[PDB]
Design a protein around this nucleic acid. Sequence first.
DNA 1: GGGGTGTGGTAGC
DNA 2: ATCGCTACCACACCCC
Length: 438
Amino acid sequence: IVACDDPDFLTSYFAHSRGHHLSAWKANLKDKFLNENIHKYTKITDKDTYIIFHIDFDCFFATVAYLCRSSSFSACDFKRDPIVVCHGTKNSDIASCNYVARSYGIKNGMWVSQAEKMLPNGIKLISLPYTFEQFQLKSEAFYSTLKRLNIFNLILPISIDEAVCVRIIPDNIHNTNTLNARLCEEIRQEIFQGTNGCTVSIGCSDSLVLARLALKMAKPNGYNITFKSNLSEEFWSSFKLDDLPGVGHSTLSRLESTFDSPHSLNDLRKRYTLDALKASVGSKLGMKIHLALQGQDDEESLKILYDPKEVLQRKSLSIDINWGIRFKNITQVDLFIERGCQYLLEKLNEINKTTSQITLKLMRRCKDAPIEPPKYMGMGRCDSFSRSSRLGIPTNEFGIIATEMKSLYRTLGCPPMELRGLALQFNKLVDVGPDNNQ
DNA sequence: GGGGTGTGGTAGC
DNA sequence: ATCGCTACCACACCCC
Ligand SMILES: Nc1ccn([C@H]2C[C@H](O)[C@@H](COP(=O)(O)OP(=O)(O)OP(=O)(O)O)O2)c(=O)n1
Ligand SMILES: [Mn+2]
Ligand SMILES: [Mn+2]
Ligand SMILES: [Mn+2]
Ligand SMILES: [Mn+2]
């Protein structure tokens, strides 16, 4: 048990934070792509016809945590009991629930108390601990399998549990659905054996947006092949609005009142005009949502195939800590700001870059929000503020960066005990070259 | 036109 | 108890 003002707080919070493990796994996957394909150039051109295999583990954490469960859960049955991965018993986020749990309508992200209340009496929720190293190991088996199979020209990290895999079809050869239906089976089986029992689902299409939607139609433990020539009302009607890329809870809300509450992608499909759509959710987002409702990708999304190196290169670096923030005085806020900058400088140095620009974001307790929110150590309800500072010459100096960071907090005006959350960023990054003379 | 900003949206949760 | 993390783009304005 470690308070925010203990020198050890950052290391411990990161050791238990599944969100931190997720972002770091993500980040390490993107660097290994940039080292593996440093002199390879098997990227996607417009001269290429390609198919997208979008591959993802079914209830990833839930599965790995069950497969590696301690002897205390030996009798747990993974297709018979609702299983969640979580820290706690009340206001603890469910990082992953199995599909037994999803029948009762439990979702990823809910709290244990909120998922328990949806089970009928006589049904027990099972809560497995996080198994972070096993998550990492299993993922490694997944990416090793994909590359070993020798059937993709580009393998794109999406996640600890996801990749977009591109196969180029030479125009001599002729692709068919039984050929496709059957790479899927090879992939699913090979990953199953390699992961010692984890299952993946695959969506397969001539577009990223259709492979994403197909992947969702395929889950659990299955695969869906849906090309643009296969589109039907039956397809669109099997999706809700935020199933679509580019649609989070706010865009979703905006669409639901500009178009008389569409309930399936088919509804939205038949009721929308491009121009009312732009005016409702924003023009660029609206042109992507319009493209997506036809199965076609956007130019912003296609870049990941044409220059995946430029897309997956890290253009900023940052930490976020919005849990357990309870400082009493400014001296403690500064020391923790200092310990954050040193951690970020460690990351900046491992990648041999400087930063031109930093940013501090913070969360401040809303004036009438309780000082302790329902969630233990939660941020509670907060307004956020941020400020940025452009540094003269790019640097990796702790003196300069930490001092400007503490000044950006001194400037935002937030009393130490109203602090509930901190974010520390390095924005513009420069590679350190061989010349360093003025 | 270019450059900047803080806020807010999506994505991967 | 409980561990609410990162990275990118879009936008509405301001500057020269
Ligand atoms: N709100 C969330 C969503 C996901 N995760 C973690 C746990 C997941 O196991 C992992 C992968 O995310 P996915 O979106 O792929 O969800 P799942 O793999 O758990 O289930 P599925 O993809 O079959 O729907 O990310 C989390 O911690 N909090
Ligand atoms: Mn998954
Ligand atoms: Mn996933
Ligand atoms: Mn959505
Ligand atoms: Mn997901």
